[PDB]
Design a protein around this ligand. Structure first.
Ligand SMILES: Cc1cc2nc3c(=O)[nH]c(=O)nc-3n(C[C@H](O)[C@H](O)[C@H](O)COP(=O)(O)O)c2cc1C
Ligand SMILES: Cc1cc2nc3c(=O)[nH]c(=O)nc-3n(C[C@H](O)[C@H](O)[C@H](O)COP(=O)(O)O)c2cc1C
Ligand SMILES: O=C(O)c1cccnc1
Ligand SMILES: O=C(O)c1cccnc1
Lengths: 217, 216
């Protein structure tokens, strides 16, 4: 199906059917989407928690407390639930892991080619960590980009999903000990098939007119 | 099919200046920009689509300094999209959004519309008043739009490259964004790669899932 039709027809699912699970093939496909998203300098400043078991989804759902109880059932009824996490700080060890992996994958023709890439990555990494002091935000933006790629991708797979910011990140981070591991949760994305209670499945989509948001030059 | 698109796309390093988007594609990329999801459907963004040589020139002025390596990508691509985010979430915009949702018929009653507005303001206030991370929150939504865009244009059979290597202060001034209430975050040239695109034939590389992903 044409990608624009996918974009115009997908929606944020409000209720999922707990008896409908992803096929083993789709389960593998969503992980592929997560891994291959692009990122600034191929920095991949992220970690993903994919909850597919009843106990796993229950642990994530704990973060939907208080003013967020409305998002709890979404996390519990979906087939799979993805927690998008961003590193809390950019360290040289990670920078080395990335360029060594690119080297292992065969992207460099010579040693100086690898040296240049690393020097380049380091340059922009330091601009954010040392000059602007905003590497935390910088990395989080990369995670949000991944989320955007993911939502369109799952929709193109014929699966329902919903992006969720309505959860307590302090609770979720603690539930999985993310802080001490060097990460923090940003977005939760339940994936599966919608249920009869998905009131948003029949409502028309709505966006501002391009005459407001877009300028052609 | 979408997985193949994801694995085959790549960041284009050089574009063929004589290859332009078809009229249809040029309209399709705008639809992609408009229809991206966003928290509370806040749509805290603005897009500049440069397709003329004069326009692309204006945007390319931001690729100076140690960013000159990105200048040619901006001049040779068929179309160049500048992704901008609001600098502050104002009540007028919140009203604009709910009014549009109303016009689009998403509300069965005035109460439902009020409930929707109340809910949106709760999270808008949480960022604007409680956390003071208003600007970052909106910027994040813009990056989500970019992610949606890159996959989408690839699915359309178009080449592109996301670019952070540019001077935002310079770009903002060239288009007088600061005064209009916006700021540039990422530039995305779109078109078709040239034989000079060395990245078109290099293997793609990503960290292993055994390090980045945990199954529970
Ligand atoms: C980052 C992000 C966070 C959001 N949070 C939630 C949430 O916590 N609960 C919910 O039901 N929908 C949530 N949404 C869904 C939006 O309200 C939705 O994307 C928007 O109204 C546009 O509708 P659509 O996704 O159906 O096109 C969020 C969207 C994004 C992109
Ligand atoms: C937000 C963002 C900013 C980036 N900036 C630039 C840039 O300024 N110049 C460039 O040539 N590539 C740029 N990159 C491309 C990356 O190096 C690239 O996405 C990544 O190495 C993985 O490559 P792939 O896109 O070919 O899969 C950017 C990527 C993202 C997502
Ligand atoms: O990925 C890159 O090559 C890159 C990212 C940001 C700024 N300059 C270059
Ligand atoms: O878009 C929503 O409905 C939303 C966004 C953030 C938190 N709670 C709800």
């Amino acid at each position: 199906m044409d990608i624009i039709s996918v974009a115009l027809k997908r929606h944020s699912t409000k209720a999922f059917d707990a008896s409908k699970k992803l096929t083993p093939e789709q389960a593998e496909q969503i992980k592929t989407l997560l891994q291959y998203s692009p990122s600034s300098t191929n920095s991949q400043p992220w970690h993903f928690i994919v909850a597919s078991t009843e106990e796993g989804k229950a642990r994530v759902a704990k973060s939907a407390a208080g003013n967020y109880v409305f998002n709890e059932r979404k996390m519990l009824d979906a087939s799979h639930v993805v927690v998008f996490c961003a590193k809390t700080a950019m360290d040289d060890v990670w920078l080395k892991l990335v360029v060594d992996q690119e080297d292992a994958d065969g992207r460099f023709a010579t040693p100086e080619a690898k040296a240049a890439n690393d020097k380049g990555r380091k340059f922009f990494a330091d601009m954010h960590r040392k000059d602007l002091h905003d590497d935390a935000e910088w990395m989080a933006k990369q995670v949000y980009l991944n989320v955007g790629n993911f939502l369109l991708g799952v929709a193109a797979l014929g699966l329902d999903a919903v992006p969720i910011e309505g959860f307590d990140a302090a609770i979720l981070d603690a539930e999985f000990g993310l802080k001490e591991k060097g990460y923090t949760s940003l977005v939760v994305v339940p994936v599966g098939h919608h249920s009869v209670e998905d009131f948003n499945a029949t409502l028309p989509k709505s966006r501002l007119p391009q005459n407001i948001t877009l300028t052609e030059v």
